[PDB]
């Protein structure tokens with residue numbers, strides 16, 4: 001029953017890995033500065049992901065064994081937003097602008113799915129028992145590993161070329177997201193009702209992640225001049 | 233409606249407490265420059281556009297045949313347009329400053345504006361499994377707090393608008409009037425609540441006002457930390 005949930009996540013990962021946005025980001029015949037055109041889009045997400053971890057996943061009030069594991073893991077995942085801001089500046093995307101241009105960017109209709117991903121995960125998660133929150137987190141982190149494996153390609157290109165330490169679109173981020181881990185609790189037996197719910201979770205997490213990546217792809221096409229401007 | 237009657241009475245009681253908060257004492261104090269009273273204005277950024285999104289994507293359900301949801305949808309069309317008024321007045325007040333992208337992000341996601349940022353998030357979570365009649369209690373409670381907030385803010389706003397001969401749209405009487413408001417949701421006091429609905433509605437009104445008071449506390453503390461600073465309207 002868990003076996004099947006864990007296999008559905010690997011199926012969803014395999015279709016997710018194939019999305020056009022990822023073939024573009026991986027395409028070494030395109031400059032990495034051009035492939036990281038979508039980097040600013042992450043603003044509408046990276047900081048919501050911090051809040052999801054601090055406020056929605058974490059429950060310091062709880063005494064349940066599984067929620068304590070979750071509480072521990074959310075502790076680390078809530079720190080990566082500063083890495084996003086680090087690489088924003090390294091990539092020359094930390095541009096001076098009117099406050100209103102920053103707000104109109106975050107709340108753009110073209111970044112609706114990006115901005116609402118974490119909100120959707122919080123709504124999905126708020127009435128789940130902790131083992132079912134661990135399915136949300138495990139599926140989400142699978143979509144996450146796919147996204148950051150791809151972005152760390154042009155990221156590490158720029159990092160080595162410019163000799164600056166990238167922290168977000170970087171192997172160190174992909175490595176510490178992976179490196180008791182939650183998947184290790186594939187020694188859990190799902191009731192019939194939990195299996196039906198775990199199907200809803202894994203499907204929604206991958207559909208919402210697909211919608212975000214579609215928005216990233218549309219942004220690149222709408223902004224093909226606005227390549228990253230790193231400095232040696 | 234004696235159950236419904238209690239709910240409407242609880243909202244008035246919460247409004248009476250809410251109107252008396254220190255933030256609104258400050259905002260209403262004509263012995264202080266309206267420029268210093270609106271120094272909290274930029275804090276609304278973390279709320280105004282989230283409110284638009286709550287109306288567009290959470291409150292609204294275009295496909296519903298439900299009598300109550302069709303009335304909600306009509307009200308959401310209008311109330312989701314006010315964020316442009318927010319950005320209009322942001323510029324007029326001199327608060328649409330040049331800054332790095334990251335300075336804007338760190339502001340919006342400030343730990344000092346957590347309750348401001350998450351008010352609409354909390355309403356969407358509260359609203360997720362509500363039948364349309366109960367979504368109306370959420371909207372009426374919320375709007376009761378909004379009308380208190382904007383009635384207060386419109387006082388220094390209209391002061392600046394008159395003196396600078398500029399049209400303010402957000403911290404302005406026009407906003408309060410159009411927001412107050414075919415049928416108004418409160419006119420749906422021709423509805424009776426089951427005992428269980430009545431319990432849920434009490435929970436709704438208590439949380440809406442708790443979350444609204446949390447936002448106002450953050451504004452009050454922001455003001456305290458920015459008293460030397462003020463709005464810079466141009467004539």
Ligand SMILES: N[C@@H](Cc1ccccc1)C(=O)O
Pocket residue numbers: 045046049077080081140141142143144145147148177
């Ligand atoms: N690893 C991301 C979070 C994330 C998880 C899953 C999917 C996408 C993003 C971060 O630090 O911001």
Ligand SMILES: N[C@@H](Cc1ccccc1)C(=O)O
Pocket residue numbers: 279280283311314315318374375376377378379381382411
């Ligand atoms: N009237 C506010 C929204 C709001 C509603 C309810 C309470 C508080 C604020 C706006 O236009 O942004």
Ligand SMILES: [Fe+2]
Pocket residue numbers: 077080173177
């Ligand atoms: Fe991360």
Ligand SMILES: [Fe+2]
Pocket residue numbers: 311314407411
């Ligand atoms: Fe409004």
Ligand code: NI
Pocket residue numbers: 073076177
């Ligand atoms: Ni972990």
Ligand code: NI
Pocket residue numbers: 126127357360361
């Ligand atoms: Ni719920």
Ligand code: NI
Pocket residue numbers: 223
């Ligand atoms: Ni653009």
Ligand code: NI
Pocket residue numbers: 307310311411412413
């Ligand atoms: Ni209305």
Ligand code: NI
Pocket residue numbers: 457458
């Ligand atoms: Ni300040």
